[PDB]
Amino acid sequence: NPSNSNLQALREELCTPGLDQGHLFEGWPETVDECNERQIALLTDLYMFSNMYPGGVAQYIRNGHELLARESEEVDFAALEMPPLIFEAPSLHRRTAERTALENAGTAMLCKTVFVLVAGGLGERLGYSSIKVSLPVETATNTTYLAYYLRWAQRVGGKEVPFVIMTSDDTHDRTLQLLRELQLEVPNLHVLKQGQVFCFADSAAHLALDETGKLLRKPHGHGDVHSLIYNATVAQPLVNDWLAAGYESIVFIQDTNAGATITIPISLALSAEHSLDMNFTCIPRVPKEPIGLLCRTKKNSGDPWLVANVEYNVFAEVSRALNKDGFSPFPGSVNTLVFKLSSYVDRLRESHGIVPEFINPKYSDETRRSFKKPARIESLMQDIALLFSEDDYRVGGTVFERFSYQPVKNSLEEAAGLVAQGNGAYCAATGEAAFYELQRRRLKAIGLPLFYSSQPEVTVAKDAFGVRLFPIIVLDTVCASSGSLDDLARVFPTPEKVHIDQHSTLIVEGRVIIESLELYGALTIRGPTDSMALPHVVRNAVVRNAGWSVHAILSLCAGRDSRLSEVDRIRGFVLKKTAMAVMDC
Numbered sequence: 172n173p174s175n176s177n178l179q180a181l182r183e184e185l186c187t188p189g190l191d192q193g194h195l196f197e198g199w200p201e202t203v204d205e206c207n208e209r210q211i212a213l214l215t216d217l218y219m220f221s222n223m224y225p226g227g228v229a230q231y232i233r234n235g236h237e238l239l240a241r242e243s244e245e246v247d248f249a250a251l252e253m254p255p256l257i258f259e260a261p262s263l264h265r266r267t268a269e270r271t272a273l274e275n276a277g278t279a280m281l282c283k284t285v286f287v288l289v290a291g292g293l294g295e296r297l298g299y300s301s302i303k304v305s306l307p308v309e310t311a312t313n314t315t316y317l318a319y320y321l322r323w324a325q326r327v328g329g330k331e332v333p334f335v336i337m338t339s340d341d342t343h344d345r346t347l348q349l350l351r352e353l354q355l356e357v358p359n360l361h362v363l364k365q366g367q368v369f370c371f372a373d374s375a376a377h378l379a380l381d382e383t384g385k386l387l388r389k390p391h392g393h394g395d396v397h398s399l400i401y402n403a404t405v406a407q408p409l410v411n412d413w414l415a416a417g418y419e420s421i422v423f424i425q426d427t428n429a430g431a432t433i434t435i436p437i438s439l440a441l442s443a444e445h446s447l448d449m450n451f452t453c454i455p456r457v458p459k460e461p462i463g464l465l466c467r468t469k470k471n472s473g474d475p476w477l478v479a480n481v482e483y484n485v486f487a488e489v490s491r492a493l494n495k496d497g498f499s500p501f502p503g504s505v506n507t508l509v510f511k512l513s514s515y516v517d518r519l520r521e522s523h524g525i526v527p528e529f530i531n532p533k534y535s536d537e538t539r540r541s542f543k544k545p546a547r548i549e550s551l552m553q554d555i556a557l558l559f560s561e562d563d564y565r566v567g568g569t570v571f572e573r574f575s576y577q578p579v580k581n582s583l584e585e586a587a588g589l590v591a592q593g594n595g596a597y598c599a600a601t602g603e604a605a606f607y608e609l610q611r612r613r614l615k616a617i618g619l620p621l622f623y624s625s626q627p628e629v630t631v632a633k634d635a636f637g638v639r640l641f642p643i644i645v646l647d648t649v650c651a652s653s654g655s656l657d658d659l660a661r662v663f664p665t666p667e668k669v670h671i672d673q674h675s676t677l678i679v680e681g682r683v684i685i686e687s688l689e690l691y692g693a694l695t696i697r698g699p700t701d702s703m704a705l706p707h708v709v710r711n712a713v714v715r716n717a718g719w720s721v722h723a724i725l726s727l728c729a730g731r732d733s734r735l736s737e738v739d740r741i742r743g744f745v746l747k748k749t750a751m752a753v754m755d756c
């Protein structure tokens with residue numbers, strides 16, 4: 172593509188004061204012609220960066236200088252306080268008139284919602300070699316996070332629901348593989364792959380090389396999602412297609428928080444009720460939490476207030492210097508972002524989806540100033556809130572119960588350490604446990620008589636903590652529709668005649684109505700896969716069998732003829748699916 176002369180001009184340019192990338196061409200011949208294919212390739216790699224980053228590599232270096240100087244300084248705001256527009260959501264396990272109104276209002280709005288899934292990470296930090304959306308939400312059905320989100324979206328928004336997945340070099344191919352393998356048919360899905368950015372070996376922003384001598388690359392952060400969307404087409408801009416088709420909201424979700432399918436309808440309803448352009452999904456936060464705080468900020472004493480997320484580390488540092496006259500006052504943002512689409516698009520078009528950047532290098536020492544590993548510039552998807560002036564827009568937050576926040580983000584060992592400090596585990600074990608409990612709390616809210624012990628049923632991480640799983644009740648999207656309390660009530664029309672023992676397992680797939688049941692064991696009930704077909708009705712059912720059990724993965728663990736996978740090891744237990752009754756037709 173690019174010319175021999177253009178590559179020469181760029182090389183020369185990069186060697187000028189303020190750029191100083193001479194180290195990249197150490198011992199090269201005078202002109203491009205004389206350069207070998209390998210050298211020609213590196214210059215090409217530098218050159219093509221322009222169609223990936225605003226201003227290309229030259230501006231990247233300049234930005235690096237600015238940010239590196241900036242981050243060497245002390246972060247501080249001239250003003251910081253509670254956001255004006257904070258709204259408390261009613262409990263998810265109480266079927267009050269208010270909860271009902273918000274759920275049904277939000278559910279209608281789901282019909283005009285665009286969904287965006289941010290999925291550019293592996294679960295390595297968890298102990299998981301594959302993509303995080305391939306993690307199961309729970310091992311009873313093994314439904315992946317990916318299918319979980321996609322089927323819900325297609326349920327509430329129909330088959331042609333507009334859906335974006337942002338991937339990366341790490342997750343992209345595998346994401347496409349998973350889509351194919353699960354036979355997911357999503358006509359209006361757009362998979363947008365973020366590009367990695369160059370790295371700085373040092374504080375002078377000298378570009379880093381890898382082991383082969385090629386330019387080193389690292390992720391630019393989830394902030395890329397806005398740029399990717401701004402540049403996506405269907406020759407018509409993606410966002411224009413959405414707008415013209417009548418879509419009115421857009422929501423952004425993380426890769427392993429199943430709670431989003433519960434919070435979203437509520438947030439949508441509240442966004443409409445309080446005319447919110449941007450609505451941060453929040454929870455009350457404990458000061459000892461790697462979660463950001465939603466704050467009304469003012470960077471300089473002359474600026475306007477901005478409503479935006481303030482990262483935990485920053486808020487810590489910020490506080491000690493400028494104190495001016497059991498959770499944090501400010502809400503904790505879980506990064507489920509809800510927008511009025513028209514407002515989002517306006518800001519998008521104005522900024523080209525570019526959001527403020529930062530750099531956060533890891534040093535070898537406090538004093539030696541040397542990097543431990545090459546740094547790169549990053550961006551956060553939530554920082555788009557900075558483009559929404561308080562004069563033109565209403566940016567606020569909705570506060571939910573902490574229980575509705577169920578990320579799978581820590582390894583078993585990390586969770587052990589965390590639990591000891593009295594903090595949340597947020598590992599695969601507690602994620603799975605929380606999902607089962609969530610179903611139970613929702614079901615009880617409509618009158619299902621679920622009596623079960625709160626005692627843990629298995630201990631993980633060398634006996635560090637326990638979780639319980641049973642009773643296990645999982646209804647698919649054809650059965651439970653949107654998951655609203657009203658939708659659940661359709662499955663259980665006369666709840667008081669349904670008696671699910673605390674040790675039982677109930678799996679429901681398809682169009683099923685359960686009127687009366689006594690279950691002591693494991694049961695799967697299957698109905699029509701078509702949401703519009705006549706339902707399989709269960710009445711006067713009695714099922715007794717050995718059902719399922721759970722036990723910890725033993726420390727002894729090693730050995731051939733083994734069936735333990737990473738999925739098992741990252742949660743520290745295994746379901747034994749001993750027996751299972753099936754009711755079809």
Ligand SMILES: O=c1ccn([C@@H]2O[C@H](COP(=O)(O)OP(=O)(O)OP(=O)(O)O)[C@@H](O)[C@H]2O)c(=O)[nH]1
Nearest residue numbers: 289290291292293303337390391392393425426
């Ligand atoms: O460059 C990135 C970084 C993060 N993310 C998205 O970050 C959410 C939170 O990302 P975090 O930054 O909070 O965690 P992480 O990336 O270290 O690990 P993952 O979450 O990727 O597993 C997930 O949606 C993650 O895929 C991206 O999509 N791209």
